[PDB]
Swiss-Prot record:
Name of protein: Isopropylmalate/citramalate isomerase large subunit
Activity-pH dependence: Optimum pH is 7.5.
CDD domains: IPMI
Alphabetical list of InterPro entries matching this protein: Acnase/IPM_dHydase_lsu_aba_1/3 (IPR015931), Acoase/IPM_deHydtase_lsu_aba (IPR001030), Aconitase_4Fe-4S_BS (IPR018136), Aconitase_4Fe-4S_dom (IPR036008), HAcnase/IPMdehydase_lsu_prok (IPR011826), Homoacnase/IPMdehydase_lsu (IPR006251), IPM_dehydratase_rel_enz (IPR050067), IPMI_cat (IPR033941)
Enzyme class: lyase
Cofactor(s) the protein requires to work: [4Fe-4S] cluster
Protein residues bound to [4Fe-4S] cluster: 303, 364, 367
GO molecular function, a single term: 3-isopropylmalate dehydratase activity
Keyword Iron-sulfur included in the entry's annotation: yes
UniProt xrefs under PROSITE patterns: ACONITASE_1, ACONITASE_2
Organism: Methanocaldococcus jannaschii (strain ATCC 43067 / DSM 2661 / JAL-1 / JCM 10045 / NBRC 100440)
């Protein structure tokens, strides 16, 4: 009787069974690296004299196509990456501006149910939306992965969030996950896989599911995971066909009599629009109880969201209420080029433009970085981001409220923190 994570790690280590706390050596299906972890990893490999990665088709590299105009080190790192990709015969390499980190990997078909996914970023948990075991690892582990196609993992315990009921109007999976995190706390799920399931999750789209697993790490989770269903299978198969990345996969599900460290019953019909308020993702408040505070900027589409359903719900709110308030900069960033195209074809982009919204291209590098330069001092911002920028948020006592795309759009409309149901 095993959880989905246990089964995935059992299969991957060739074991009959696995229990939390077991330390097992698991085959890696896909390893993703972007920005600096790329050059660290390649360098470590050079130092050990490793001529070849284990499988050039199970490595996904995101890297800036533009040579950085000043620093010679980054031009050097850039030449290094191109050499590696070429010599190793790495098939799957993408511009850092193909999309935000965690959008590009699944949309090209690189994440299937039952797979072990490792990534250089803290928010690789995102890919657990696909019934995959997905974790962020450092460059030392990443070099080991590139060399051998294996890594030691400690099997985590699972907390199961059973989410049932129907989401009320104007409420999204962003509000569900934020509400879960306000209760559990930034450290409440340390070492644990956070599994979301239940009738409410079944009805959610893949896009909505990804927003939840995206933020598992924000409560100290080891990862986030949702079992695959028909929507999952069809998304993955369609993505594989579009990009030529077909490979066999096994849909793995947890057992009905699996053990969990904890089980939360989440009443979805009770979730309301919420904000994560400065300065902790933990500090979650019902929108009404903060409503009224004037705001300077709104970011709709961020790390990792701004998929088509996010852009729809945002543009519907804005266009219905006649555009955006005065003295609010509203930046709209589709999660990927592929998502940008879908929005373009549906006339959504043209409409954001019409209301004086800035529409900008996504960049994986933006998710990793400093917010120095984007927010002015003392400015209040509403963001659909699913990750914190603590430490380097940044410029410097700027205030940043995390919200769903619906609430973010509402805020853009009124020019203040507002509950979208109150427009
Ligand atoms: C990446 C970003 C520009 O969306 C972050 C934020 C916090 C300003 O939304
Ligand atoms: Mg992210």
């Amino acid at each position: 009787g095993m959880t989905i994570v246990e089964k995935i790690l059992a299969k991957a280590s060739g074991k009959k069974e696995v229990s939390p706390g077991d330390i097992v050596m698991a085959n890696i299906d896909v390893a993703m690296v972007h920005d600096i972890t790329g050059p660290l990893t390649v360098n470590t490999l050079k130092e050990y004299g490793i001529e070849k990665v284990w499988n050039p088709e199970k490595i996904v590299i995101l890297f800036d196509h533009q040579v950085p105009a000043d620093s010679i080190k980054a031009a050097e790192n850039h030449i290094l990456m191109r050499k590696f990709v070429k010599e190793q015969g790495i098939k799957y390499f993408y511009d850092i501006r193909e999309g935000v980190c965690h959008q590009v990997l699944p949309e090209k078909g690189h994440v299937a149910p039952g797979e072990v996914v490792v990534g250089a970023d803290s928010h690789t948990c995102t890919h657990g939306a696909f019934g995959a075991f997905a974790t962020g690892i450092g460059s030392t582990d990443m070099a080991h992965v590139f060399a051998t196609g294996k890594l030691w993992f400690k099997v985590p315990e699972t907390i199961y969030f059973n989410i049932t009921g129907d989401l009320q109007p104007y409420v999204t999976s962003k509000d569900v996950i934020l509400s879960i995190i306000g209760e559990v706390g930034v450290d409440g799920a340390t070492y644990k896989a956070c599994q979301f399931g239940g009738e409410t999750v079944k009805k959610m789209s893949i896009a909505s599911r990804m927003t939840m697993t995206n933020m598992a790490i924000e409560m100290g989770g080891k990862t986030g995971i949702i079992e695959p269903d028909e929507k999952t299978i069809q998304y993955v198969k369609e993505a594989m066909k579009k990009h030529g990345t077909e490979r066999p996969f096994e849909v793995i599900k947890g057992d009905e009599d699996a053990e969990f460290a904890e089980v939360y019953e989440i009443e979805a019909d009770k979730i309301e629009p919420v904000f994560a308020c400065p300065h902790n993702v933990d500090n979650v408040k019902q929108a009404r109880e903060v409503a009224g505070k004037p705001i300077d900027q709104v970011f709709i589409g961020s790390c990792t969201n701004g998929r088509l359903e996010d852009l729809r719900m945002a543009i519907k709110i804005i266009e219905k209420h006649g555009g955006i308030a005065d003295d609010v900069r509203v930046v709209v960033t589709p999660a990927s080029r592929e998502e940008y195209l879908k929005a373009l074809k549906e006339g959504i982009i043209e409409k954001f433009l019409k209301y004086g919204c800035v529409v900008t291209n996504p960049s994986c590098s933006a998710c990793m970085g400093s917010l120095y330069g984007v927010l002015g001092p003392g400015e209040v911002c509403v963001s659909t981001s699913n990750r914190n920028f603590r430490g380097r948020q940044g410029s410097l006592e700027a205030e940043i409220y995390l919200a769903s795309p619906i609430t973010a759009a509402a805020c853009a409309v009124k020019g203040e923190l507002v509950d979208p149901r109150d427009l």
